[PDB]
């Protein structure tokens, strides 16, 4: 691999011990460069939290701790604190690129309230929209705790990454949150596969929900 | 302390141009380089390039290409940014980083704090609204009943449902901007609906923006 790789969304109690892996390429990790961890809290600049592996910068809490081998690298956090809840990514250096690299980011909830696992309906074009040559299909997510999932589209049984725009989580009056991903696509493509189907997955479980043209 | 400032944000339309700084202070301007990052919405951090500070060597992405220009004024204590041929893609926000050194390798100790740049080509324009469904009225599925709204500009709509004259309780939703610049959002009627009713039930937006209000009472018959 040429890129790193995280979990999308961790999860702790206040006080408890979470981990977060950040995975890298022979051509990163396997290439000698040590790997930094950045914090992005809510509405601020990124802040360096740990360089080289396992130094810590005179500002940073010692409950942030890191460590590479290998080719994972994990960064730990003991005591979990409301202060923590935010952002993080790690970063590189790639050799087949000549330039840096970054994680996809994982963002860490510290729990408020129970779980709740994301409720999801998936809608076909209207009819009023088809006829105005165009189609979009509609998945519409809601009623989920940590505020975090993962959409992934397919047509019929193959996976399709076009045309795919997701919105990113707001919280609702209710402190839970809600989301919505959109698949644009003509009306021959449309009548032209059997299924669609809107994958959302949040915190060790997927949902699936399928529509066709012929359904109704 | 070292700190890094930059220009406030920026917008412009498709195939344009644009110059972001990033003023540097607390330290020696010549002796650490300065990176640039970018991060689109859904997407993860880019680099951008590296400019040696000193002797004005530049070293960019290769994705970008001819696309970015990284320049330096000493005197001036700053370092801009320039990238031409705009498109949609290129929305995010810019930082820039200051390479420290340490006992192993290149470090970014300091970051600032970001400018975002919206290429937007859209005029003001009312919001389109269609009625989607779930679920069959031929089966026992229960039916939700959606409004969509797209092809606005700008932010925000405001949407309400009824049930004849009293107020009914919706789910809100974000708003994302699309390829072409235009936003849209869904509102979902939160009860699903047992029985079926002709005209019953209606979405209503309003869209300030453009001094309009779109309702729709009518869900059509399947295709």
């Known amino acids: 691999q040429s890129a790193l790789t995280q979990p999308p969304s961790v999860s702790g109690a206040p006080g408890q011990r979470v981990s977060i892996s950040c995975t890298g390429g022979?051509?990163?990790?396997?290439?000698?460069?040590?790997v930094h961890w950045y914090q992005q809290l809510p509405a601020t600049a990124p802040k360096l939290l740990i360089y080289?592996?396992?130094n810590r910068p005179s500002g940073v809490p010692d409950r942030f701790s890191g460590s590479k081998s290998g080719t994972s690298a994990s960064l730990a956090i003991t005591g979990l604190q409301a202060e923590d809840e935010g952002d993080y990514f790690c970063?590189?250096?790639?050799?087949?690129?000549?330039?840096?690299?970054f994680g996809g980011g994982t963002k860490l909830t510290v729990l408020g309230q129970p779980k709740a696992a994301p409720s999801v309906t998936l809608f076909p074009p209207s009819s009023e929209e088809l006829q105005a040559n165009k189609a979009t299909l509609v998945c519409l997510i809601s009623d989920f705790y940590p505020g975090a999932v993962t959409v992934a589209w397919k047509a019929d049984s193959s996976p399709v990454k076009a045309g795919v725009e997701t919105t990113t989580p707001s919280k609702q009056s209710n402190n839970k949150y809600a989301a919505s991903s959109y698949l644009s696509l003509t009306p021959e493509q449309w009548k032209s596969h059997r299924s669609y189907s809107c994958q959302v997955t949040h915190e060790g479980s997927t949902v699936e929900k399928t529509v066709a043209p012929t359904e109704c | 302390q070292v700190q890094l400032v930059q220009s406030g944000a920026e917008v412009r339309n498709p195939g344009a141009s644009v110059k972001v700084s990033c003023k540097a202070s607390?330290?020696?301007?010549?002796?650490?380089?300065i990176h640039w990052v970018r991060q689109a919405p859904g997407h993860r951090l880019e680099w951008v390039g590296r400019?040696?500070?000193?002797?004005?060597?530049?070293k960019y992405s290769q994705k970008f290409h001819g696309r970015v220009a990284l320049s330096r004024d000493t005197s001036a204590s700053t370092t801009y940014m320039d990238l031409s041929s705009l498109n949609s893609e290129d929305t995010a926000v810019y930082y820039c980083?200051?390479?420290?050194?340490?006992?192993?390798?290149?470090?970014?100790?300091?970051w600032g704090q970001g400018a975002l740049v919206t290429v937007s080509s859209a005029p003001t324009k009312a919001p389109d609204v269609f009625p989607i469904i779930s679920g069959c009225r031929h089966d026992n599925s229960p039916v939700v009943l959606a409004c969509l709204i797209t092809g606005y500009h700008p932010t925000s709509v405001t949407v309400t449902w009824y049930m004849g004259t009293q107020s009914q309780p919706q789910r809100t939703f974000p708003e994302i901007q699309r390829r072409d610049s235009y936003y849209m959002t869904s509102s979902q009627l939160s009860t699903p609906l047992q029985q079926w009713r002709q005209g019953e039930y209606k979405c209503v937006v309003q869209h300030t923006a453009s001094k309009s209000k779109k309702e729709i009472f009518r869900w059509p018959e399947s295709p």
């Open positions: 970063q590189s250096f790639d050799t087949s690129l000549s330039g840096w690299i």
């Open positions: 080289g592996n396992n």
């Open positions: 980083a200051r390479a420290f050194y340490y006992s192993s390798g290149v470090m970014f100790d300091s």
């Open positions: 022979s051509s990163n990790f396997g290439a000698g460069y040590d």
């Open positions: 400019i040696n500070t000193d002797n004005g060597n530049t």
């Open positions: 607390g330290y020696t301007f010549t002796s650490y380089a």
